[PDB]
Amino acid sequence: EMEKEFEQIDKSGSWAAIYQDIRHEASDFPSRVAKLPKNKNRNRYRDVSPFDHSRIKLHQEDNDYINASLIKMEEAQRSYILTQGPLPNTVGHFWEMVWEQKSRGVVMLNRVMEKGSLKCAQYWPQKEEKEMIFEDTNLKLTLISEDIKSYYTVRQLELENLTTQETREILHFHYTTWPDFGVPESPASFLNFLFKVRESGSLSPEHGPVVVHCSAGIGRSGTFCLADTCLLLMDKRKDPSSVDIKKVLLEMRKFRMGLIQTADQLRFSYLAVIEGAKFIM
Numbered sequence: 001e002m003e004k005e006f007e008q009i010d011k012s013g014s015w016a017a018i019y020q021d022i023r024h025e026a027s028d029f030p031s032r033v034a035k036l037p038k039n040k041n042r043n044r045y046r047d048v049s050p051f052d053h054s055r056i057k058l059h060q061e062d063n064d065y066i067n068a069s070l071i072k073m074e075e076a077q078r079s080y081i082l083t084q085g086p087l088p089n090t091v092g093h094f095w096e097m098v099w100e101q102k103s104r105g106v107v108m109l110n111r112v113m114e115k116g117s118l119k120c121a122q123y124w125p126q127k128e129e130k131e132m133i134f135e136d137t138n139l140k141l142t143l144i145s146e147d148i149k150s151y152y153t154v155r156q157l158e159l160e161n162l163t164t165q166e167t168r169e170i171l172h173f174h175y176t177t178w179p180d181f182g183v184p185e186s187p188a189s190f191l192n193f194l195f196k197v198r199e200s201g202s203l204s205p206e207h208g209p210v211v212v213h214c215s216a217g218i219g220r221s222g223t224f225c226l227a228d229t230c231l232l233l234m235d236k237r238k239d240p241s242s243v244d245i246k247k248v249l250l251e252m253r254k255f256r257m258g259l260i261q262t263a264d265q266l267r268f269s270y271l272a273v274i275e276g277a278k279f280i281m
């Protein structure tokens with residue numbers, strides 16, 4: 001059981017070394033569409049690109065590019081869209097993707113400002129009475145209700161397709177307490193947040209894939225969908241020990257580069273999964 005492997009890596013302090021093996025073993029696939037010069041202003045970081053094979057395509061015929069990847073975990077029957085925090089000029093694209101993919105939830109793992117810089121556009125309304133219209137994509141977005149708690153906020157949004165007058169209810173799950181530097185001391189609140197998302201049905205196969213992001217959509221977003229997938233495989237399987245967090249992470253990396261940015265995030269994922277199991281007993 002990984003619990004023993006955890007103590008071993010921890011007692012030897014081999015985390016940086018484990019992490020480097022994963023870096024070296026990780027897939028590399030073309031990302032030609034991301035690097036086209038017409039798409040330069042659709043990427044927040046020049047070194048974080050979706051692979052062409054797993055990129056989400058917008059159904060607008062002009063330019064179908066968005067920095068988003070579909071991560072399909074076949075065994076766990078789970079899918080996720082990892083994307084970057086939208087830019088001022090991609091908020092309309094972001095909501096179009098949510099519409100086109102029939103997503104039920106958006107999980108946000110960053111504050112709009114961290115380290116005194118902007119990590120993300122304000123892409124949802126702040127007040128009931130002040131809805132947002134995206135002109136470029138013919139979508140209207142309305143805050144319905146907002147439920148602020150210590151570690152996270154849940155918002156009920158209405159997304160209206162102005163073209164067809166269809167409306168959908170979107171859930172916004174905003175983990176608001178990820179520290180500016182490093183990782184939470186305890187995974188307790190992250191695990192509570194994860195289950196809250198599960199309970200909503202946002203991760204369920206009767207809906208399009210959940211959209212998950214931080215600023216880049218590889219670090220904290222990686223930790224979210226690594227933990228969800230590992231915990232799900234632990235119920236699914238005859239034998240728990242089978243599930244190897246390093247194998248699951250490398251399988252996820254075939255879909256999006258860089259998932260889990262630091263050895264700290266690797267250690268924290270182990271801790272979340274180990275603790276997360278401990279709540280099954």
Ligand SMILES: COc1ccc(CN)cc1OC
Binds near residue numbers: 075076205
């Ligand atoms: C019958 O449905 C499922 C069975 C197993 C898993 C996960 N291994 C997910 C499912 O989705 C509902």
